[PDB]
Design a protein around this nucleic acid. Sequence first.
DNA 1: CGATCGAT
DNA 2: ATCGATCGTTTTTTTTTTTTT
Lengths: 271, 628
Amino acid sequence: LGPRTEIANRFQSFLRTFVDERGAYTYRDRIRRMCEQNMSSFVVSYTDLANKEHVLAYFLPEAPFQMLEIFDKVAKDMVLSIFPTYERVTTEIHVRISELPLIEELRTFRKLHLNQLVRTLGVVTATTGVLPQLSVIKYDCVKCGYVLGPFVQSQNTEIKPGSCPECQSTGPFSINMEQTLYRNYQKITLQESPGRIPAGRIPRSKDVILLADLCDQCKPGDELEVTGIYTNNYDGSLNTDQGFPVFATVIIANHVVVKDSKQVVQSLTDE
Amino acid sequence: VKDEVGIRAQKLFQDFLEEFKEDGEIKYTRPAASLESPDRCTLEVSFEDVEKYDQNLATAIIEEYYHIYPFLCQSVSNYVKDRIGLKTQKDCYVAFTEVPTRHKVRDLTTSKIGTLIRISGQVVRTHPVHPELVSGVFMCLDCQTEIRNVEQQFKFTNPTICRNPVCSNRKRFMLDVEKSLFLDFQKIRIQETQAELPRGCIPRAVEIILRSELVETVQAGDRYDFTGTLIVVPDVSVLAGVGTRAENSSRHKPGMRELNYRMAFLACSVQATTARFGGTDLPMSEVTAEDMKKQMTDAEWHKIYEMSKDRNLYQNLISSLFPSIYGNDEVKRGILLQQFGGVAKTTTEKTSLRGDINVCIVGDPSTAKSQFLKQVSDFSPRAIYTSGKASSAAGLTAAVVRDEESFDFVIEAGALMLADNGICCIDEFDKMDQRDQVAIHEAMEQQTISIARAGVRATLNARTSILAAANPINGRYDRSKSLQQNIQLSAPIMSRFDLFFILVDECNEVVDYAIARKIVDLHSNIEESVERAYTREEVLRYVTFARQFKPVISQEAGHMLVENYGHLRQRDTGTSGRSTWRITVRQLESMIRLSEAMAKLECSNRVLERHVKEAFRLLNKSIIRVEQ
DNA sequence: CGATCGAT
DNA sequence: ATCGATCGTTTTTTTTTTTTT
Ligand SMILES: Nc1ncnc2c1ncn2[C@@H]1O[C@H](COP(=O)(O)OP(=O)(O)O)[C@@H](O)[C@H]1O
């Protein structure tokens, strides 16, 4: 729109306009430094974001999903436009945040926190190993023997259009094991620390999702700080019910931070 | 429709309390007024006030409640509308009270439903928060999906026929988790009343549920007062119910589910009594409605200034909590400093700095060193006592498990360990095994402790001081061996404990008859105790206030605590020839907070050299008291 | 035992 | 719209070895 175009423009006229470190801003060059090491995990400052334009604190929680998407789109359209040399290897991006003036302990988050901006910590426990999932929907026709084609995918929902090279026909189908896009996976099970309990009873816990960029960093019993966001499996079997819906809650990680972080770590001041 | 009488009833109840409700004042508008900004939707209502103004809707209420209940929410919305420019976001939680009748787990029938009755019990095997998106939006697939209807029933059914069109009536739209109606509860269990403990049958247990505002304020070891909302429970499947089964076989002209329902129970009110303390901004029995730092934190300054000003109140207060007791007058003044604050500095990231101090009792047998402390559990908050052998080393630790219940290894708490900013003293420090002993060897000083063999990154912490209960070898202080052989114990804890104050026994007849003369006013059932100077209420309020002050040292005795301590180790330069003893900077640390607390008595900051001198006197007392 | 699906 | 003929339908167990304090 007129205004709904200006989101990406604000990012563009942010990353090379809001400048500190005595000139020659990070996000002028920090993105270059991300492309250099082949990471694709650029991270953003909420502090600096508010120091530029406060506006995108309220325009986030109504759908932080679309905020993050409309950001990383800008990272591509900048990178491959100025670094078309990049356009072989990965050519896909998403960004992170590390400034949220809040720690929500566990046993603190409830129905108001639904599907919006979050922070919390805890302790790791046993979880899964290393697996991928899918990323794109494509099958194979057999009435005409064609491909159904690739189809636009919703987060956990079916598509099934009639349009396809088989005279837009062939309701039935089969599926291949290739020509389709993949995505690593790993899980976590988060517990709360033995210091900040309610002083003597059993503790609480909920589970957390990490994604293909995010695996083989955690371990059982490790130190941590994560933004994450509040999930909802939208149906853990609604019907003629219990005395209670069998619902659950997860957090999906955007930016995980280790609070030990025993590697060579810090950025550089300019001088 | 049935309950329109209830509609008009609570309507004109509002319309009356829309005017005054109580003496030109209303008790349920300012709670609602605080509600108006965040709009949290909980307001308890007095059940007495139905009988005051509505003239016994109680019996209009206390049977058909479950059906009437929802209309009270509409009534609530109608209340909030009248003076607030209002949207229908408003809701209705209730936490009912002012109800007389108190029944228990036995008077249960089909006839007990839709009431508000108040009930207690115990709390066991608690269970967690588990949300609920009860509502959403759902109809046919094409366009006609805007559905904020009544679809939130417990028995949930996506299938709806249609609203506008002739369209799918089993093919649904997709879901709404975005702009719809959700809420929360939890689930726990309850055992039979310990006030109603008959023979024979088991502790029949009830199921229990909690709404929003009730949540995470139930807890083990607590009795309650519920609503009486016994249920028809929208259950799904069960066995052994082989009674007759029915279902509507419709009209003949030219889906199935087995039916066996079970019971549970629901409630929307709590007064978790016997578990309520309140700090200092609570107005007590004795108050003085005045201005202060906070509401009632010291608004009795009108007296507490006086209780902080006398040079006599030291001894008077030393005598204002031992009316029924008589012994030495050194622990009667020192032991309070254990309960009294310490240092409380505002300082660096060097390491945790401590406020509390170790404290001891030793004495010969039958001296009522127990009765000093038997009351202390009844006295202080956070600071509940038992013995150490009163449990296992699942006192310090939890009960060590080696069977699978949730993840097969659980040691995450204890009994010493949950005494955060209260003391949980113990008796019998001499014959207890050397396990918790070496645990305490650092758990008192380095209040940051760990374990292995089952550790979820084990990092626990002690918080308070201690009270000891030694007794000699022979039962008597027969001066026939050194103290290190009189008790047969270790050094560092005899230095970790910076304060001893042993209570020695003798035989002089006047003493014992003077004790019986205490007894003269122990069973004179009118005047079975001695006079006092200061009531308990003001006492504990002054105690609760005297911390919030930032004690300080800038004093030349602060500069020349070097002098008194140099003399401390000058006179203690010996204590090495005849049965050597050891000096150590824990003594200095202890004297420091001791002097500081001794000035915290003053309701004042800023240490004075009087406090150093008395502290030096008292340390001299303790160390020469250690002399054989 | 249930839903799909075809025609009458 | 109505009836009827089409399609597709499945669930049952308890106990022994090595390990840790
Ligand atoms: N000054 C006193 N005031 C009140 N009671 C006392 C006093 N001196 C002795 N007693 C009584 O003597 C008894 C001491 O027993 P206690 O010391 O508790 O046994 P133990 O020596 O095993 O600890 C108490 O019951 C207490 O009532």
